[PDB]
């Protein structure tokens, strides 16, 4: 129950990343480990919360496409330490390296997503995050969901850019976070798969994107799928993406449909 | 916390059974594999070494130990685990005949030191370490755990204080000596010897050893020293799993 890794035990190796609140490194404990931890050795309280919630969902995380939180320090600094997985995003294979996967590698992408989602529900933890860059593609193989954005967290009066494209029409209205939210994103990520595209290609700015699709005036464009998609993955597509939230289906049956279709290659 | 509610898991195809418990793979949020006892009404050894599996399980949480899920107690004392693809190395080695490039050896024993640095630091003594019990999950990273069932067959990875009857974490680093000799020779120790008997006997006296010059001729020459130092006879002339993971983690990184 004490996750807690003493200090001096892990070597900080190269740095892979870093924004506002925290830097990751890749580090040597016990193997191969990824650390974060934050820039600073006072944190603000709001930066403290985080940081306890953070580890709050991580320890409540044993799954297989759940990315391997393994423990956190907090001296000097306040680090979190998870698994080290080689490869990239689904983001990257999907739109930055021209990965060109084959439909049964497709369908077994969202297989792996939905079992770690529905695992995600199941704990009752809410992404609130679920785009094609926090699924990560473990050795070009097995799904690693985590929140991998070095995002800068809330201060204690600030009331997303590269995660618009994956928002609810309710998310973006913020008149919030719940699981048919995180169901709504996972449609968008049926969408790349699908299509090989991200959503609203033919929409120059961002700002056109978040007033349209928050009054309703726009959707993906379905008519974009490969021919060889499956024409049940089509309508599991459509139902995740409904405007209205308790119109999208659970992850369990979301799951089970997609079980189906595999075991039908 | 990690309980799971009754009716949740869905036991599907049975992959092994024994004298008290049976394992089976299962549908909960994905493949798991669950392990059970056959009976409804465990005694108290029962339930206090199901609690014992339990407690020692969910202190880990490593890519090379097989992963921990959750438990349940209705009906059954289960166990539910991750569900690995492929094989043991045990399996791959001695019957599937599988070649493995020596890199690959290096990298399975990497891993495996990986696995047991870790369990020895959070001070977990695995006293079953053998070729059987290290999985290859999808014919690549190494699951260490506890894949036997008791049925009312680990000789050959026994110290000889074992074998005298004892565990130790010195013991536990023998039994990766005599994995490591699986590795670079590709036999099992002792292939001359007829019987069982007479290995729990001269191995106990100290007129038994095994023969390290099987090893192929490619092994890395400090493999060699590394696992003689890991058979030592003396417990307290064994290296301890930290030393053991650095020499082969630069050994793998020098290739
Ligand atoms: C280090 C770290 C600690 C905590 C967390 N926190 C979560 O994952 C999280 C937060 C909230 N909720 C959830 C939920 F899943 F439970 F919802 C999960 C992430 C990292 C981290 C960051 C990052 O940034 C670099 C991106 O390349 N790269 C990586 N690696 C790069 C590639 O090789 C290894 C992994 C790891
Ligand atoms: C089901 C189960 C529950 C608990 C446990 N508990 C430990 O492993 C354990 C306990 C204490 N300490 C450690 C340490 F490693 F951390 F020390 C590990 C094991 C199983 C289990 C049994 C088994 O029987 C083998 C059937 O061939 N096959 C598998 N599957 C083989 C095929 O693919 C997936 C895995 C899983």
Redo the contacts between chains.
Sequence with gaps: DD?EIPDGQITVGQRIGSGSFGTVYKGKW??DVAVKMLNVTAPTPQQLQAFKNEVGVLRKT????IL????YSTKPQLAIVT??CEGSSLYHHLHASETKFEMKKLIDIAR?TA?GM??LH?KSIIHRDLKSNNIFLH?D??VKIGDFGLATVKSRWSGLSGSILWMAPEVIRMQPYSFQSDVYAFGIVLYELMTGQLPYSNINNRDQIIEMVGRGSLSPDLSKVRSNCPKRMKRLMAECLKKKRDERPSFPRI?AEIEELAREL
């Design positions: 996750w016990h193997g044993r799954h297989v496409n391997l939180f393994m423990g698994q080290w792996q079992r529905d695992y199941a050795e193989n097995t799951l």
